[PDB]
Design a protein around this ligand. Structure first.
Ligand SMILES: [Mn+3]
Ligand SMILES: [Mn+3]
Ligand SMILES: [Mn+3]
Ligand SMILES: [Mn+3]
Lengths: 296, 296
């Protein structure tokens, strides 16, 4: 008699090894190859060349930078240690599971990258202040716990919706500030780290959104419209919360109206990644041209 | 605004962002830096240069290669999609959680590496035969399910024992075949992939063993003796199962006696990684010098 006897008795199917010689879904390999081929670490960018421009930024500019980036750090802490991991048990293929392990690791790299920027540029009180701020900010804690409630729930398709909205709407909206500052010749090296993150996030939201589309299409037409209604209700909830977050972060700098156009731009893109038309008319999504061009 | 108000009352602590400016355990950063600095993909090695060498191998050498490597594939499929992931919720630091996301990813890299070798060198029936064999082999299924029983249980320390025995004993013992062949100038490019895997496995077993030692030290003497007895019983159980596996894989080739010495060598190292003296006298662990050196 062994402690593992009941486990084995209740698990009679074989444990399987992943076989890359048979690929049920070619997209899994395409995305594996793309994401692994894009591996990077923040140390490859010389953020220390941003010390001059950081020191010339205003107190309001530096405060917004600390808070936006600590919020992003929070999101990718969640996405690497809880979100991507939560998608593994529901994978359609073993190759998709392998892709989620890459995504979890790269989210840790993303999260670390913000500390590399902070440790190079910011003061010790500034860093401590931002982390304590992030733990008490009601809008940031609310968006985090809303997304995590789906990761910790038992509906696989809702986890993929939550993930895609986190990546394509919440995280993408945080790219406003580095892109703005870089188009003004500030924090230009930090923006290069952000572009590496964007190069990953673009693929993450497309791929998990693709998997969501493939899953919901297996359902009845009535069940599909129930998932679409769920998605639109959650999107609008997160958008309203993001409006408040945005006013609080950007009102003093005066960037709020353009960031709100960017929110609507990114909300439509997140819905598109899930196979749905946008919640906003296109002419409400006109973020300034530099921002978009700065993305790449 | 409804679906998650019970979630929040069950989850009242703040969600935290990882902060790499404060490191409670410097080992977490040292291992992060080592493992991420050692990133590799199997396409970096010219395994096609091994085609002539493979073609000159006997049917018995090819069969053993296919079977050993498919069992290693199984182990790292488990380790990357179940094992490392199971350690995250028990982590003492957020930096340790980040490390486990790298380990999970790199176990997927390891697993894929065996397919790269197979797809380059072996025939399609050989590959199919090997994956079906792995699903039905009683010793390979038994060792997998015993380890998984701990990943799926509720005892954090037992997960770390299981993981360290998987890495430092089960996986390491599979390195015999590629090291032997390479010492005989066969499949030498394949052996360079295996050396990259060993460079990672060496760190994984050290680090998770370290975390186990730190955790069991926090316990009373009585509880520490209980975990040590648990560990020795599980090690000898896995050892007996591995003896049978080894006889079946290596008897035809005639390598069995030296592989068994390597089993005891690796059993003692796995126990050392967990803070314990060995189950075998050191003179029972004299694997041939060639193997030890080509390993490294
Ligand atoms: Mn990310
Ligand atoms: Mn992402
Ligand atoms: Mn491995
Ligand atoms: Mn390992």
């Amino acid at each position: 008699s062994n402690e593992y006897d009941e486990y084995i008795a209740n698990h009679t199917d074989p444990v399987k090894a992943i076989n890359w010689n048979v690929i049920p879904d070619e997209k899994d390999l395409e995305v594996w190859d793309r994401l692994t081929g894009n591996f990077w670490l923040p140390e490859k960018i010389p953020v220390s060349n941003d010390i001059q421009s950081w020191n010339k930024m205003t107190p309001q500019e530096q405060l917004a930078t600390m808070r936006v980036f600590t919020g992003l750090t929070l999101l990718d802490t969640i996405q690497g240690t809880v979100g991507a991991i939560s998608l593994l048990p529901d994978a359609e293929t073993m190759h998709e599971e392998a892709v989620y392990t890459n995504i979890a690791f790269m989210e840790s790299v993303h999260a670390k990258s913000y500390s590399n920027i902070f440790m190079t540029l910011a003061s010790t009180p500034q860093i401590n202040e931002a982390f304590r701020w992030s733990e008490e900010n009601e809008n940031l804690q609310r968006k985090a716990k809303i997304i995590m409630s789906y990761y910790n729930g038992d509906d696989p398709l809702k986890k993929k919706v939550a993930s895609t909205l986190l990546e394509s709407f919440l995280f993408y909206s945080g790219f406003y500030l580095p892109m703005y500052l870089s188009s003004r010749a500030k924090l230009t090296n930090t923006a290069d780290i952000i572009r590496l993150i964007i190069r990953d996030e673009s693929v993450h939201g497309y791929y998990i959104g693709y998997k969501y589309q493939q899953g919901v299409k297996k359902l009845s037409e009535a069940e599909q419209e129930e998932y679409k209604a769920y998605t639109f209700d959650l999107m609008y909830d997160l958008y309203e919360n993001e409006i408040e977050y945005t006013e609080d972060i950007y009102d003093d700098l005066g960037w709020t109206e353009d960031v709100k156009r960017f929110l609507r731009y990114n909300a439509n893109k997140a819905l598109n990644n899930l196979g749905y038309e946008g919640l906003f008319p296109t002419d409400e999504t006109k973020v300034s041209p530099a921002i978009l061009s700065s993305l790449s």
